[PDB]
Design a binder for this molecule. Sequence first.
Ligand SMILES: Nc1ncnc2c1ncn2[C@@H]1O[C@H](COP(=O)(O)OP(=O)(O)NP(=O)(O)O)[C@@H](O)[C@H]1O
Ligand SMILES: Nc1ncnc2c1ncn2[C@@H]1O[C@H](COP(=O)(O)OP(=O)(O)NP(=O)(O)O)[C@@H](O)[C@H]1O
Ligand SMILES: Nc1ncnc2c1ncn2[C@@H]1O[C@H](COP(=O)(O)OP(=O)(O)NP(=O)(O)O)[C@@H](O)[C@H]1O
Ligand SMILES: Nc1ncnc2c1ncn2[C@@H]1O[C@H](COP(=O)(O)OP(=O)(O)NP(=O)(O)O)[C@@H](O)[C@H]1O
Ligand SMILES: Nc1ncnc2c1ncn2[C@@H]1O[C@H](COP(=O)(O)OP(=O)(O)NP(=O)(O)O)[C@@H](O)[C@H]1O
Ligand SMILES: Nc1ncnc2c1ncn2[C@@H]1O[C@H](COP(=O)(O)OP(=O)(O)NP(=O)(O)O)[C@@H](O)[C@H]1O
Ligand SMILES: Nc1ncnc2c1ncn2[C@@H]1O[C@H](COP(=O)(O)OP(=O)(O)NP(=O)(O)O)[C@@H](O)[C@H]1O
Ligand SMILES: [Mg+2]
Ligand SMILES: [Mg+2]
Ligand SMILES: [Mg+2]
Ligand SMILES: [Mg+2]
Ligand SMILES: [Mg+2]
Ligand SMILES: [Mg+2]
Ligand SMILES: [Mg+2]
Lengths: 245, 246, 246, 246, 246, 248, 245
Amino acid sequence: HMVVADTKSLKLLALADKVAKTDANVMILGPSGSGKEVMSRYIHNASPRKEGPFIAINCAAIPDNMLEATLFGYEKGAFTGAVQACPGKFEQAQGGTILLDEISEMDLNLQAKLLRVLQEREVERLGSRKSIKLDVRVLATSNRDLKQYVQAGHFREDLYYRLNVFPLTWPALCERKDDIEPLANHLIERHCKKLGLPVPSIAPNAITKLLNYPWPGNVRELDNVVQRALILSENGHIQSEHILL
Amino acid sequence: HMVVADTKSLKLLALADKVAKTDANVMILGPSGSGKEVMSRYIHNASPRKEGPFIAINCAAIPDNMLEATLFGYEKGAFTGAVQACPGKFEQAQGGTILLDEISEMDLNLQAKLLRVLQEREVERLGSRKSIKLDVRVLATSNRDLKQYVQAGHFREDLYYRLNVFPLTWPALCERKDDIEPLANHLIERHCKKLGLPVPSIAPNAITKLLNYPWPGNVRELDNVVQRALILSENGHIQSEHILLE
Amino acid sequence: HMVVADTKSLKLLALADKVAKTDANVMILGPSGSGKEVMSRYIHNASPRKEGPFIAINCAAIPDNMLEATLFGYEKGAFTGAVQACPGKFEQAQGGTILLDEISEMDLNLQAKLLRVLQEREVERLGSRKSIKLDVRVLATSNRDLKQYVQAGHFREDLYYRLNVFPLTWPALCERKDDIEPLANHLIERHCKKLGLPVPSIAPNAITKLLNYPWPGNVRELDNVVQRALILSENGHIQSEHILLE
Amino acid sequence: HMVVADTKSLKLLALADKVAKTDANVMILGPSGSGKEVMSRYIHNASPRKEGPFIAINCAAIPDNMLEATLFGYEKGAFTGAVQACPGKFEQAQGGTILLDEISEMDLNLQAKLLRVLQEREVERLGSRKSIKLDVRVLATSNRDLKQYVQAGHFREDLYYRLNVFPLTWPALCERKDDIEPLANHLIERHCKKLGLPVPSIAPNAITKLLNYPWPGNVRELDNVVQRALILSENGHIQSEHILLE
Amino acid sequence: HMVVADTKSLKLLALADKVAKTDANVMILGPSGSGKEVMSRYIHNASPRKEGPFIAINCAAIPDNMLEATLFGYEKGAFTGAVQACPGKFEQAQGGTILLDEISEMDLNLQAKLLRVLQEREVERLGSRKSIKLDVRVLATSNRDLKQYVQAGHFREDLYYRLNVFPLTWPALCERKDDIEPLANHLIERHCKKLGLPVPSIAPNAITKLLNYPWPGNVRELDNVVQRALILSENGHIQSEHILLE
Amino acid sequence: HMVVADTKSLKLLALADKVAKTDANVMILGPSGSGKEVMSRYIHNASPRKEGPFIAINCAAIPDNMLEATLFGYEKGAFTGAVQACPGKFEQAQGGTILLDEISEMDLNLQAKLLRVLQEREVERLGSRKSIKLDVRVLATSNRDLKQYVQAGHFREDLYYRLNVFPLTWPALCERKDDIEPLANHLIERHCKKLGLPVPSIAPNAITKLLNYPWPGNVRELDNVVQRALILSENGHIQSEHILLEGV
Amino acid sequence: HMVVADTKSLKLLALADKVAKTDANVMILGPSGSGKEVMSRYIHNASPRKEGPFIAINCAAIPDNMLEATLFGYEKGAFTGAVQACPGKFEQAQGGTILLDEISEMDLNLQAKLLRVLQEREVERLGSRKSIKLDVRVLATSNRDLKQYVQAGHFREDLYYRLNVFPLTWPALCERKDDIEPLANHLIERHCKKLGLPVPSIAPNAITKLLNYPWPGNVRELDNVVQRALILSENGHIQSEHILL
Ligand SMILES: Nc1ncnc2c1ncn2[C@@H]1O[C@H](COP(=O)(O)OP(=O)(O)NP(=O)(O)O)[C@@H](O)[C@H]1O
Ligand SMILES: Nc1ncnc2c1ncn2[C@@H]1O[C@H](COP(=O)(O)OP(=O)(O)NP(=O)(O)O)[C@@H](O)[C@H]1O
Ligand SMILES: Nc1ncnc2c1ncn2[C@@H]1O[C@H](COP(=O)(O)OP(=O)(O)NP(=O)(O)O)[C@@H](O)[C@H]1O
Ligand SMILES: Nc1ncnc2c1ncn2[C@@H]1O[C@H](COP(=O)(O)OP(=O)(O)NP(=O)(O)O)[C@@H](O)[C@H]1O
Ligand SMILES: Nc1ncnc2c1ncn2[C@@H]1O[C@H](COP(=O)(O)OP(=O)(O)NP(=O)(O)O)[C@@H](O)[C@H]1O
Ligand SMILES: Nc1ncnc2c1ncn2[C@@H]1O[C@H](COP(=O)(O)OP(=O)(O)NP(=O)(O)O)[C@@H](O)[C@H]1O
Ligand SMILES: Nc1ncnc2c1ncn2[C@@H]1O[C@H](COP(=O)(O)OP(=O)(O)NP(=O)(O)O)[C@@H](O)[C@H]1O
Ligand SMILES: [Mg+2]
Ligand SMILES: [Mg+2]
Ligand SMILES: [Mg+2]
Ligand SMILES: [Mg+2]
Ligand SMILES: [Mg+2]
Ligand SMILES: [Mg+2]
Ligand SMILES: [Mg+2]
């Protein structure tokens, strides 16, 4: 469930609803913790593939450099430690959507293979010469500017244009201030639902405190402040702290 | 299919037509996304070999450092990782055309080997002294200035001459604006036909917006702009953006 | 047992009691030797998991680069050296508390692995695809500015926010001086009980000497001074030394 | 066959004919595309050894660092990868001529080996102790200044003298312009004969265009311009291009 | 046997007597050859562990890496070369004292391991998951300055405080000139007993020569001078030479 | 055999005759192509060991750094590629003379082993433990100043004194012009006899041309010029080429 | 046989005589070609161990950096290439004297191993746990200022003192020019005896040449001149070449 109240955010929402009906690649941009991931999940559920699989892979969080292995999958003995066969992420997303979180940090080599997959609608596992027809909708996410990455030599131009037909950008939280109260309430309800507890309320004062803070860490940071506030138990007074904790 | 409308592109088309009749090596130049690939396909379809195989190998996209192994093919156990025999690209192009896409990414080592293939009209697979006679027409493309690439010592001179007997160059898309509107109509058409959507038209004011943009990314960028316009939806108007998305 | 006497430490204590009640990640900050480890054990014992296991891992003291192996455990064969299967730390801390001591020293590869565990509440050993459900409360300590570490690119930002919902910070000893005497007495006592020696007191002049020193090393340095003083012998007078009375 | 018309070339030719009659080492110099290769072939055919084998090895074109292996041959086992025995090029050249194309690319190690072969008129394969008696006339070419190479420490002086008893140098094409018209016709003829067609002719206007170009690529570049002209089609006219068009 | 005569040394000996009876870690400092080792042996004999083993391991004289191996011990096949099982130094020191000579030279890695042993009073061999309970008194010497080493990033702070509860420091020999005559006689004596010679005396004038020299190499240098004097020969008489001739 | 005509070379020759009679190590010095090699053979043939083997080894010409292995010999196993046993150059020179040509090129390590052999008069092959007794006279040449090379730390001092009891130095060819014409005729005759041709003479103006050149490559370069001359052809006139210039 | 004439050298000789009688470590210093190894043998023969073994090892002349292995000895398979057992130089010195020639070029690791052997009077071979009791008198030479190497960090201070209780230093040949005529004569005799030939005399003329030369390489250089002079056959007469000609 995605909270949208600010008029810039409704604009975003209506853009997203448009692409979500289609099978175009969606590039979801925005600063840290600004909600790129809930947007990607929103588009899947808004899309005609809603009932199909939703597979995510964070290319910025895959240790041991198993990014290529995770993506394409592999056969037993495709490399050191390949002790078994293993389907790629694309295989799991058949008939649904795949989310490439942070394609920016994918290496050039891997970008090449990914491009071919996008061009061919096919994929082979590492160690395999057998092709697999894909019916997969593609979403991607980036924290960097891909254009600048292309200009800087770290990203392929052709891969760029393919992934960026329809880019969606979250404004930073301080640019869409009307989202703050609705978001704050949501995060409170969220957390309290988890713990069987009834949701408390937030003092006007506390709300004001939340409104006049620029939120460098955006909605992630807000969520942090909200959870903190609940520990200083259930309400919302000046139980909000940002930078004097 | 290749659209041509601008009289610059017609002169180019005319040149391609001349050389396509022959068996000469064709080098196809031009900026990124200007149509080097679709040109090379036109030359094949125009040539006496149109019914033969068209094999493309993109040196600028061959991952895992496999350019050599892909080009020449390999026998089983020719290197660590070669679990099977695999014919090279020239073998596949037997009786038709091979396309060496972005040959400037080829290192001096492989350049030497290619030169020998072009000289002897023969190739051997890695791990084999079996000499395979070829009848393969050669096309190539480059995003780089091959001439200066030779002077910088990254490309062999003798190869450069074998490859540049008949160079064809695409103008950047903004140097040939009469191509823009028929290209947009073409891109829209093929996108819609692929998706199975009825194909709409572009409003005149939308056409104007497209003509007064320089297209840094050329036809590729135009394709991108046009697919974006379609999503914004069917019958383009001011659903064109390039720098002001917002 | 944790000695608290200065009003700063009392405010800190009351905050600890607040989070202990909950299952929230607690981050413990403060200079070297200021009590971060004992505060961790305090929170576990104040928590409803106090009857459960307390498991500690000093990420800054795991030699032979076994920090990953120690945390997650490993099947036999997982790496050259792994002669046996071995349970990870999260495993041992099932139903209780794990303490991540000096978590800032954990590299970015490991940090990502950890994030996964916090996000999923599941862990697999090195060399295994077997996911193990965790019911484990997390505490972490750092004597580095984790906010700065994120800015230096040495620390994942998302990991940071997950670990810093409720940061608790020990002031340096020199800015909670009402802690100094009770601590000195505490350290003396526990050292003497341990050694089976009678425990002596401290003379007022020695107390004044302790209060007027800045404790660069904090409570650890105080413990040092006390133990040295006891060697010089029983019933401390100015038998205190720091720099330079030696 | 070799086209000679300029008096500089004719002077070359007379010199070439003088050495051809002998068994002297011959060093063939001059810029790129100026005919060093076709001169070496001429000398061999003018020599008493013309019925004998003619063996070229281009040291600047042997991929994979197989230069040592190619020249001396090898036995199975000799080096990792050598799956079989292989005769060297000197062996093949028995009773005739060998052409060491671009000797300046040989490393000092190989140079020491070449020197011993020249001194002793025998050779061993890599991996073998059997010396094979040689009766082979040596020709060589360089694109680089070898006397300079010696002074820069990159070429052995003793080898330099053995190989340079009689150096022959091609003038650049621009400084023997009487060659250009006959070469161009020879090249048109060459291309046409290879394709069954009759030779076209060159309009006086086209000749003049050819004559007032400096040919930085020498005869190789001229060949290029000739073939391009033939694709542009069969009666040289304004079908000649150099650096403004194609 | 340790000779003490200067009031500074006597102060030092009294402090030594105070720590000897305790189990406290002792750190012994001082310039080179100033008697750090003999103080170690003195503290042991003065301790209630006197009849216990006295084990030394100088980390500044251990050939190869090893050190970790010789300190902790190893099982067979614990690393390339470990051909037999070997007891560690700590193991050997059971019930007595271990002397970690020049601890400054341990790398951070091994420091962490050492730190674990001190905290836990347990050691494992390289290769074993089996920990051995220790009852070992610890001594250390260093040539470097440890606090500066800690500030340099080369020595762990926690290990430092643990090892440095009671640092004992030898003044340079020139700062305690009353030790010189009895040391001179003691060294002669011990040298002559060992060689089975009568022990000579030192003439008053030779004593003056010894007192008015700075002793850059302290007692070691003195031993050197005194052995030299004896070669020059018996009852010493301005048979004393220092650095600067004969 | 050796051509000597100039006053300086006759004196050098006389010095050679004195050592040749002895067993002393001889160091032969001089610029590139000035005849150090032919001087070696001269000393061997003038020595009482003339009937014995003359084994040479050019340390500046042995490919694949198999210098040490070639010197001392090796047993099957000593290193990889040592699929057989092989006698040393010292072993082959038993009863005769060994020539260490371009000895300035041995790495310091090889110098050490070389010193031991000269010290003890014994040699062991690589991978062996048996010392082989030696009766071998030693000759050495260098392009470098070994004195200089010692001060640069590239050449052992003790080895230097052992090899330089009696150094003989060829002056450059331009410093001994009376050698030029006898050499040129000797080089022609040698070349023509080998190829089975009549041997031509050199016209006086060709001699003159040859004398007024500084010969930076010395006798090697002379040999070169003279072989070029015979190709341009018979009875040498000014078919003499030197630099650029560039005739026929 | 040593041959000493200059009064500087007779002082040297008297000091030598004094250490020889003892078992003290002797450090022999002096410029290259001074006679350090001549003196080391003189010390052995003057000592009570004169009937025992005299084992020399040149640390600056051990190829294939086999110095450690040569010193301590080794068992089969102690290190690749060690196809057999081999006693150290200390072992074969048992009951006599070892000479460590050029001990400055021993590395720090080996120095530590050397210190241990001198402290414990024991050695064990490479690849062996068994320690061999030693009764070996130690001599050593150095071309370098060891004190300075200690200051430069290349030589252990503790080893330096153990080895330098009694340094003997040769003056350069030019500082003790009375040695020059007797040494020259001794060397002519030497060389003539090895060849089985009558020894000739040197013209005073020639001797004067010998005394007015600074002998940069000392007695070894003088040797070269004398041998050279004799090739310019037998009767030194200004068959003397140095750096005049
Ligand atoms: N519009 C929204 N409605 C509801 N929850 C939201 C919204 N935006 C953000 N959140 C929540 O706030 C946090 C934002 O994190 P996230 O969706 O991961 O943003 P992000 O841009 O992907 N961060 P990252 O990729 O690490 O730079 C998550 O806990 C979301 O559940
Ligand atoms: N004249 C044309 N007619 C039709 N489609 C065209 C034309 N020119 C370019 N395109 C399309 O534009 C896109 C760009 O790819 P391509 O045309 O082959 O350019 P390119 O020069 O090879 N790009 P690159 O090699 O990556 O620098 C493709 O989708 C082509 O189909
Ligand atoms: N409030 C306290 N009550 C009792 N003991 C304390 C207290 N504070 C510190 N100590 C003791 O003094 C020493 C301080 O150590 P510790 O708790 O490890 O601090 P730390 O912050 O974790 N040091 P570090 O190693 O830099 O991470 C230990 O012996 C503690 O047991
Ligand atoms: N005199 C000539 N007569 C006929 N063809 C010639 C002549 N000179 C050059 N050519 C042709 O020009 C081209 C280049 O000649 P080539 O013998 O390769 O010169 P090159 O100096 O060896 N080139 P390179 O080795 O790369 O520096 C070939 O096609 C030759 O056939
Ligand atoms: N007080 C003392 N009484 C008797 N002998 C002493 C005394 N001090 C030093 N020595 C002797 O002097 C020498 C050097 O002493 P030592 O204990 O080795 O000093 P050190 O400081 O530990 N050397 P180092 O660690 O290398 O700087 C040894 O021979 C000792 O036995
Ligand atoms: N005096 C001479 N008599 C006869 N032939 C000579 C004479 N001097 C030189 N030569 C010949 O001219 C050439 C000179 O070469 P060489 O004798 O090898 O001199 P080198 O000093 O050893 N050259 P290098 O080792 O390269 O510095 C050889 O071909 C010799 O045979
Ligand atoms: N006093 C001497 N009496 C007799 N022979 C001497 C004397 N001094 C030197 N020699 C001889 O002259 C040479 C000097 O060499 P040596 O005795 O090895 O001195 P060295 O200082 O050890 N040279 P090195 O080890 O290479 O630095 C040898 O040939 C000695 O035999
Ligand atoms: Mg993300
Ligand atoms: Mg391309
Ligand atoms: Mg800690
Ligand atoms: Mg060539
Ligand atoms: Mg010590
Ligand atoms: Mg030579
Ligand atoms: Mg020596």
